[PDB]
Amino acid sequence: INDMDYPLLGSICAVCCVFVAGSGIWMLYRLDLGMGYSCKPYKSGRAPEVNSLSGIICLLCGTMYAAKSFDFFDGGGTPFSLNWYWYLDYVFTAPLLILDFAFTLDLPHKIRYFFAVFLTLWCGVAAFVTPSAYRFAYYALGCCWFTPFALSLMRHVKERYLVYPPKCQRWLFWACVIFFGFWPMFPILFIFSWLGTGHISQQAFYIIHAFLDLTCKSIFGILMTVFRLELEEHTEVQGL
Amino acid sequence: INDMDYPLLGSICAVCCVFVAGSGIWMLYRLDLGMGYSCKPYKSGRAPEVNSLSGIICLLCGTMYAAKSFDFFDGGGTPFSLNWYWYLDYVFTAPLLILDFAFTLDLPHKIRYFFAVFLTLWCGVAAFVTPSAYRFAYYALGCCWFTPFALSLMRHVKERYLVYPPKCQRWLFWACVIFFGFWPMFPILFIFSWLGTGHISQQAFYIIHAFLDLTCKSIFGILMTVFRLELEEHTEVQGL
Amino acid sequence: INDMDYPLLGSICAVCCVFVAGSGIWMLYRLDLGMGYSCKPYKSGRAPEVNSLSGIICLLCGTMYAAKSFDFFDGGGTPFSLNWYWYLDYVFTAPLLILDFAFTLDLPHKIRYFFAVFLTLWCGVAAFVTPSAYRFAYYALGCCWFTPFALSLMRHVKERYLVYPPKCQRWLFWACVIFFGFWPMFPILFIFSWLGTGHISQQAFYIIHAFLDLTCKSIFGILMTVFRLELEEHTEVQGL
Ligand SMILES: CCCCCCCC/C=C/CCCCCCCC(=O)OC[C@H](COP(=O)(O)OCCN)OC(=O)CCCCCCC/C=C/CCCCCCCC
Ligand SMILES: CCCCCCCC/C=C/CCCCCCCC(=O)OC[C@H](COP(=O)(O)OCCN)OC(=O)CCCCCCC/C=C/CCCCCCCC
Ligand SMILES: CCCCCCCC/C=C/CCCCCCCC(=O)OC[C@H](COP(=O)(O)OCCN)OC(=O)CCCCCCC/C=C/CCCCCCCC
Ligand SMILES: CCCCCCCC/C=C\CCCCCCCC(=O)OC[C@H](COP(=O)(O)OCCN)OC(=O)CCCCCCC/C=C/CCCCCCCC
Ligand SMILES: CCCCCCCC/C=C\CCCCCCCC(=O)OC[C@H](COP(=O)(O)OCCN)OC(=O)CCCCCCC/C=C/CCCCCCCC
Ligand SMILES: CCCCCCCC/C=C\CCCCCCCC(=O)OC[C@H](COP(=O)(O)OCCN)OC(=O)CCCCCCC/C=C/CCCCCCCC
Ligand SMILES: CCCCCCCC/C=C\CCCCCCCC(=O)O[C@H](COC(=O)CCCCCCC/C=C/CCCCCCCC)COP(=O)(O)OCCN
Ligand SMILES: CCCCCCCC/C=C\CCCCCCCC(=O)O[C@H](COC(=O)CCCCCCC/C=C/CCCCCCCC)COP(=O)(O)OCCN
Ligand SMILES: CCCCCCCC/C=C\CCCCCCCC(=O)O[C@H](COC(=O)CCCCCCC/C=C/CCCCCCCC)COP(=O)(O)OCCN
Ligand SMILES: CC(C)CCC[C@@H](C)[C@H]1CC[C@H]2[C@@H]3CC=C4C[C@@H](O)CC[C@]4(C)[C@H]3CC[C@]12C
Ligand SMILES: CC(C)CCC[C@@H](C)[C@H]1CC[C@H]2[C@@H]3CC=C4C[C@@H](O)CC[C@]4(C)[C@H]3CC[C@]12C
Ligand SMILES: CC(C)CCC[C@@H](C)[C@H]1CC[C@H]2[C@@H]3CC=C4C[C@@H](O)CC[C@]4(C)[C@H]3CC[C@]12C
Ligand SMILES: CC(C)CCC[C@@H](C)[C@H]1CC[C@H]2[C@@H]3CC=C4C[C@@H](O)CC[C@]4(C)[C@H]3CC[C@]12C
């Protein structure tokens, strides 16, 4: 029985659509202005393609929630629902975030991080659709993909959290707080959801992910964008 | 009721399969011969990977119509139909065209153009499968993705439509005629199709897209290929 | 009627999961140690991203068989089966192998090889799901994609099978034996399977592919990894 306040879920996703996509539009707006706060012709004249992943993820997530709002506003499972099959939305955005983060600090093993998160989500997608005792087997299969990735990412972050000046170090620090504080929240919610323990009802499950995706895309993307501006101001505007 | 001349639709797709794929085979045939009309060892000996997207798109589209012909020749919706779920075919080819066009003139924002068309098609794919009033909401969601992309592409084309010599400028001009004259034809057909207004029956809907895809893949790809030959003849064969 | 020894098929896939993924873990283990057998700081300190495709394919295939084991252990077609729709698993791994092989020897036409195998598998995926006389039409469509690719790959291999020293030439030779001896085995099995002639029952069909995927991913990947070590030892450790 999925009797729940669908217009409320549609309203939240509509609000999340405006904020995440609106931040994405601003995110691309500030990219093609200069190296940082000061406007510069950006050498050739075009920003690097690796510096525009943060904005597109929000727009990709912004239109993702718009489609979910249409599913929720209708009052059931639309053919193009994006909500009936869980976590299929994050299969495309989440591997872009770590790749976007990898290019920001020039982290190594960018391809490994992409497939670690791509396969973590797909294992999770398999968990929701399987209504058997092997749903936790896929979850266990997902967790043994995410855990080595999370611990390997944290290490390479600590190495790079040593040369950046304190001006841009705070922006990197808050990005990691969103990273390691809210990415592990998705597996935790699955355990306690109606699929696992049962503490969290399905209606409240959508709402938490709506706020998590604000944090993981828009707010994390804003932190990355401001971090790039401070980084390029200190290096390519100050020479140091 | 989908009572329509399926063998006619299969015959058209079979004919479209031969022409588009046949052009693609020629497209890759002329690439590995030299810089342009005159044969040159191409420096290293291999053509750049970015210069072979035009041919593969036609082969990808050529085999795409072969699968549609099998669906039409059977006389219904085959399990691997490629026609029951509309525009799922263009989700992979259309984002390759703008990326192929972007690499040809070295347009900036190549990643943004890819996702603008990738998400334009997916929003359109969502429109066909949803049999509710939100089908036009997905169409409105698709149009607000395509329109900024179309206007931003046109601008960066005008900037590059200033340095090319008139010999290769005509090839670029006709590519843009196919670009901005026939890409906007796909959204227009959706409004007037049986899903929207109802002017165009479903049987005639396949036929128009069969000719549009000839123009958008094979004919547009031929224009791009000839444009590259003239471009490289003037630059890397003449020194100017 | 699919009455077959499902726990046996689950056990084989579980065993294949451990070996392929275990080899993949070792494959990435030996990459970040040095150029070859001798440990070297690898210039910058990080291995090239193109040198880590072999390990990830095995991990991608290792987790692929784990999901199949869950489907087989359950005793039927799970919602996330990976076995009900055939060859959908290889759509992602097989195009990575030829791309991984292309980067190893710096083969040209890397993009063409990727789409040749990507479209060969998709045409094959269409063959299994279509229960009509056009299943062999998709197979014929797949074979006319694979055959030009197989013959073009063989040629460019012969050109590169001339400069490598005999120390690493044996590793390349055995990689080609796995390449041209076992990749053509997949189309051959389809003809003689229960879909085609009928010699091979469905129960025995999974088992052969389980051993083929060991050879095509783990054993082929091991051959590629050892080949890289000998190649880099002779070039970047010996100077020759
Ligand atoms: C919009 C921008 C998106 C950008 C990125 C998109 C990529 C993500 C792809 C999303 C795939 C979406 C699949 C969603 C399937 C949802 C199926 C579903 O909702 O089933 C439930 C529902 C039952 O609900 P009720 O009938 O109301 O029951 C109550 C009794 N009155 O069943 C149905 O409605 C029937 C579903 C019709 C067929 C579904 C067609 C799905 C759309 C196909 C396009 C996606 C192509 C995917 C490629 C693989 C090819 C299958
Ligand atoms: C060939 C080269 C292709 C290269 C690139 C390919 C990428 C594009 C992927 C295309 C996905 C194709 C999905 C097509 C689904 C079509 C479903 C369909 O036709 O339903 C209609 C039809 C009803 O018609 P009738 O029975 O005749 O009614 C009349 C009464 N006698 O329903 C059916 O036939 C049942 C369909 C069987 C299941 C469909 C299986 C689809 C094939 C799955 C492979 C695709 C994998 C996609 C990945 C996501 C996993 C789902
Ligand atoms: C785990 C790591 C994976 C990493 C890479 C993954 C990428 C590959 C994607 C794999 C797609 C998997 C699709 C598998 C569909 C299988 C459908 C199936 O099994 O049907 C058979 C089965 C009939 O069997 P029985 O009922 O037992 O009959 C006996 C009588 N008692 O039918 C069912 O069980 C109903 C199926 C429920 C719906 C299936 C939902 C599939 C999961 C969707 C997630 C995949 C998203 C794909 C994107 C396109 C959107 C559709
Ligand atoms: C619907 C089914 C679709 C499934 C199709 C699967 C096809 C797989 C798609 C491509 C696989 C990814 C391989 C891409 C090649 C990797 C890029 C490359 O060659 O290296 C370029 C270069 C290498 O570094 P160097 O130049 O040596 O730096 C020296 C230091 N100054 O790039 C880099 O710097 C590292 C960053 C590379 C990009 C990071 C990886 C991103 C890859 C995206 C994967 C897409 C997967 C799609 C789904 C997969 C399903 C299995
Ligand atoms: C089935 C579900 C599958 C979904 C999986 C989604 C994974 C996403 C796959 C990869 C995402 C794309 C990121 C690729 C990295 C971008 C390439 C890069 O790093 O830059 C290399 C380099 C950067 O430029 P510079 O060297 O700085 O030029 C200086 C001027 N002389 O490349 C360029 O020149 C620009 C062209 C880059 C390629 C254009 C973008 C193409 C990306 C393909 C996207 C594939 C998406 C797949 C589906 C997405 C679903 C959400
Ligand atoms: C769910 C539906 C998803 C479908 C979305 C389809 C989007 C397509 C995704 C990207 C398409 C691939 C285009 C990638 C751009 C090609 C890379 C490029 O620009 O060149 C970089 C550079 C070019 O060579 P040079 O630098 O000139 O060497 C000089 C010699 N010293 O790279 C190379 O060296 C060659 C290797 C390039 C990578 C090989 C190709 C891999 C592409 C992966 C394709 C992914 C397809 C995804 C599914 C497709 C579905 C249709
Ligand atoms: C716990 C409460 C959470 C509330 C949700 C958050 C709401 C969004 C507010 C921003 C959150 C992230 C901000 C990250 C910190 C950056 C703030 C900042 O100060 O940035 C500046 C400058 O950079 C910026 O401008 C970034 C801030 C811009 C954020 C824009 C907000 C998002 C845009 C959405 C607009 C569209 C929304 C549609 C309406 C919503 C309808 C529901 C950096 O320099 P300073 O530290 O100030 O030092 C001064 C000297 N340089
Ligand atoms: C409104 C009527 C539309 C008719 C459909 C179009 C039919 C295809 C004909 C070509 C259309 C696109 C042509 C674009 C313009 C290029 C023509 C051209 O002249 O190219 C040359 C040279 O480049 C070329 O050769 C390109 C033309 C090659 C086109 C090959 C036709 C497509 C190949 C398909 C063969 C397989 C078809 C299978 C049979 C079909 C069965 C149904 C450029 O140099 P010139 O301007 O002539 O100046 C001379 C000094 N340099
Ligand atoms: C017909 C029987 C087939 C049996 C299946 C194969 C079993 C796996 C055994 C390895 C097969 C591939 C080996 C390829 C040849 C490499 C062997 C080798 O000698 O490598 C060395 C060194 O490189 C290596 O070490 C590669 C061999 C490492 C293979 C590791 C085996 C795979 C790892 C799986 C461990 C996890 C498995 C989980 C348990 C399985 C549970 C079911 C190269 O140098 P040399 O020729 O010896 O000259 C000496 C001076 N240099
Ligand atoms: C309470 C929830 C929201 C967050 C839980 C995770 C927190 C505690 C984690 C994630 C981000 C983290 C940081 C990651 C990186 C570094 C750099 C290192 O050289 C010093 C510690 C340090 C600074 C971390 C300390 C604690 C940290 C804040
Ligand atoms: C009638 C249908 C087929 C086509 C409709 C769109 C037409 C009118 C558009 C698309 C291609 C276009 C061109 C795009 C680029 C340029 C370069 C600019 O510096 C002068 C005008 C100019 C040359 C355009 C004029 C008109 C144009 C031909
Ligand atoms: C968002 C900006 C860029 C505008 C682009 C979206 C436009 C073109 C879309 C959104 C609203 C649309 C309408 C949605 C609903 C209908 C009812 C249908 O039976 C006839 C066409 C019709 C009337 C549409 C035609 C075009 C339309 C105006
Ligand atoms: C019997 C099954 C397993 C394998 C069938 C295919 C075999 C016969 C093929 C695939 C790998 C092949 C090799 C591919 C490349 C070369 C390099 C060339 O300069 C000499 C011959 C040579 C060395 C081949 C000879 C035969 C070969 C071994």
PDB file of C-alpha atoms in Angstrom, chain A residues 1 3-4 14 22-23 41 44 60 74 90 97 99 105-106 117-118 143 154-155 171 192 199 216 220 226 228 235 238:
ATOM      1  CA  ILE A   1       0.000   0.000   0.000  1.00  0.00           C
ATOM      2  CA  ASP A   3      -1.231   5.602  -0.007  1.00  0.00           C
ATOM      3  CA  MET A   4       0.777   8.759   0.658  1.00  0.00           C
ATOM      4  CA  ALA A  14       9.267  20.782  -7.813  1.00  0.00           C
ATOM      5  CA  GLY A  22      18.799  27.279 -10.436  1.00  0.00           C
ATOM      6  CA  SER A  23      22.110  26.694  -8.680  1.00  0.00           C
ATOM      7  CA  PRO A  41      39.748  36.264 -20.474  1.00  0.00           C
ATOM      8  CA  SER A  44      42.161  30.887 -24.761  1.00  0.00           C
ATOM      9  CA  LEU A  60      20.897  16.814 -14.775  1.00  0.00           C
ATOM     10  CA  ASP A  74      -0.010  12.307 -11.393  1.00  0.00           C
ATOM     11  CA  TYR A  90      21.821   8.380  -9.173  1.00  0.00           C
ATOM     12  CA  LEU A  97      30.269  13.873  -8.785  1.00  0.00           C
ATOM     13  CA  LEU A  99      34.712  12.372 -11.354  1.00  0.00           C
ATOM     14  CA  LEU A 105      42.112  18.366  -7.191  1.00  0.00           C
ATOM     15  CA  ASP A 106      43.609  16.175  -9.954  1.00  0.00           C
ATOM     16  CA  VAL A 117      30.400   4.540  -7.662  1.00  0.00           C
ATOM     17  CA  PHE A 118      28.786   3.403 -10.921  1.00  0.00           C
ATOM     18  CA  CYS A 143      28.792  -2.020   0.351  1.00  0.00           C
ATOM     19  CA  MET A 154      39.617   9.735   1.982  1.00  0.00           C
ATOM     20  CA  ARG A 155      43.327   8.903   1.844  1.00  0.00           C
ATOM     21  CA  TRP A 171      36.009  25.217   1.005  1.00  0.00           C
ATOM     22  CA  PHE A 192      16.401   1.472   8.164  1.00  0.00           C
ATOM     23  CA  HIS A 199      11.750   2.589  10.737  1.00  0.00           C
ATOM     24  CA  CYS A 216      25.038  16.356  -2.612  1.00  0.00           C
ATOM     25  CA  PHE A 220      28.294  20.247  -2.806  1.00  0.00           C
ATOM     26  CA  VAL A 226      33.722  28.442  -4.853  1.00  0.00           C
ATOM     27  CA  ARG A 228      37.820  26.472  -7.768  1.00  0.00           C
ATOM     28  CA  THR A 235      47.538  30.311  -8.461  1.00  0.00           C
ATOM     29  CA  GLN A 238      48.470  35.774  -7.838  1.00  0.00           C
TER      30      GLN A 238
END
